[PDB]
């Protein structure tokens, strides 16, 4: 929704609309999580929700970093040194639910 | 179907509308064999599912179809399949909503007046009688001469035709007499004549069991038995004003008289007497409790009787009682708010509710035994009675599972189809039961 913490809301509630463009550099962890702790009138419930949100964000960042690193390492190992009736249900009793009267 | 038929069809290109009427009449006249429950369900759904104003798209097409069918019936003037089918469609459209045919009843009146001796004509008379029953009380400020001629021709019809027409017309006569007019002295004199005739026959027979005048006037006696039965069923004249004096317990009278004529030597007399008792029963259920009625049924249904029309008649009595009681209960519950403020909170009646159960416990066992009969009609009627019982839960299901299983091996397909479907419904609710009786 709306706010400098909407991303964490989404990551804690819906998580599907959150795109690979959002996750990467939208939120500066060391600043946003720091913002969450002294924020005015924060209920414990919503705080727990936000905790799961920020942890999911961080986990996704880890996933992407691993994927890109693996891609790079696979690249670097390259070089160029030039030197009939088969299965029918038995009759119709399987699927021929009879008409009522 | 809401897009295929019930569309407003503006007043041009009349050929399409006429073709639509042809199509719908064809559909219903072909659907006459199986049942009309599905058609009514569909039409119920289409009408209810748009309750807001919203141009009332189905209402316009419906009213234009019924009035155009009226006009088609008029312009027919003189293939009979289409006439009977059109009247049948009118009947269904009255049943689903009754206001649709308030205006055209005066145009429907002439067919009831006079007719011929052919079958399809009798079906027309029966259907128009049904329509009149459904619509006449709802008519905004009717004309008294119209009611007068209605009752007159209804009586003229009662005293001149066969069984089914007598039934389906005394129904509408009783309804119209108890809903709008009040001239019940006429019907009282009618029952006086019939009661007196049959009682004189009884008295003459009591000491002359070998006389011959009875073998001559038999038709009058038969018609009298059926008529007094139907009258006692549909239109109860054991009340304050019908007699006009101190009550002489007429219901008990007719009970004893019919019960007398049950024991006799021919067959048609017995069948008509049992029919009379059944119609009497559907009005006073408590009579089933009487010892003579008990022993009568529990002897006819058992004891390896030669007759096969008595057994069929008994089972048909039970079947019509169950159906009629169900319909009365439902349609009497639907209009609660008119009587709610005048019923107790501390009572919670049962004798008006539990009764329908109790009855079955006196006969049920015997009916089940009737599954093992060599005829087919007896088996069909027994299965109808049990499948009407169980569908309201009246009786405990797992004591009539074995018979309902052995009915799964008849030749006729509709029989075992109904049986097996009843069985799968018995199972789907209650997990264990079938494993108990296998």
Tab-separated table of N, CA, C and O in Angstrom, chain A residues 98-101, chain B residues 34 38 417 421:
chain	number	residue	atom	x	y	z
A	98	UNK	N	-26.348	-42.633	-13.226
A	98	UNK	CA	-27.620	-42.888	-13.876
A	98	UNK	C	-28.653	-41.830	-13.517
A	98	UNK	O	-28.557	-41.137	-12.504
A	99	UNK	N	-29.657	-41.719	-14.381
A	99	UNK	CA	-30.671	-40.688	-14.249
A	99	UNK	C	-31.714	-41.093	-13.218
A	99	UNK	O	-32.161	-42.242	-13.174
A	100	UNK	N	-32.080	-40.138	-12.368
A	100	UNK	CA	-33.018	-40.381	-11.281
A	100	UNK	C	-34.437	-40.372	-11.826
A	100	UNK	O	-34.677	-39.930	-12.955
A	101	UNK	N	-35.385	-40.849	-11.030
A	101	UNK	CA	-36.782	-40.844	-11.438
A	101	UNK	C	-37.672	-40.321	-10.320
A	101	UNK	O	-38.387	-39.337	-10.499
B	34	UNK	N	-42.187	-38.095	-18.036
B	34	UNK	CA	-41.346	-38.286	-16.858
B	34	UNK	C	-41.834	-37.471	-15.662
B	34	UNK	O	-42.200	-38.035	-14.629
B	38	UNK	N	-38.653	-30.565	-12.851
B	38	UNK	CA	-37.490	-29.840	-13.350
B	38	UNK	C	-37.884	-28.518	-13.991
B	38	UNK	O	-37.219	-27.497	-13.780
B	417	UNK	N	-33.099	-48.481	-10.699
B	417	UNK	CA	-32.488	-47.156	-10.690
B	417	UNK	C	-32.905	-46.367	-9.454
B	417	UNK	O	-32.053	-45.843	-8.720
B	421	UNK	N	-30.372	-45.481	-6.252
B	421	UNK	CA	-30.181	-44.077	-5.896
B	421	UNK	C	-30.571	-43.824	-4.445
B	421	UNK	O	-29.877	-43.091	-3.719
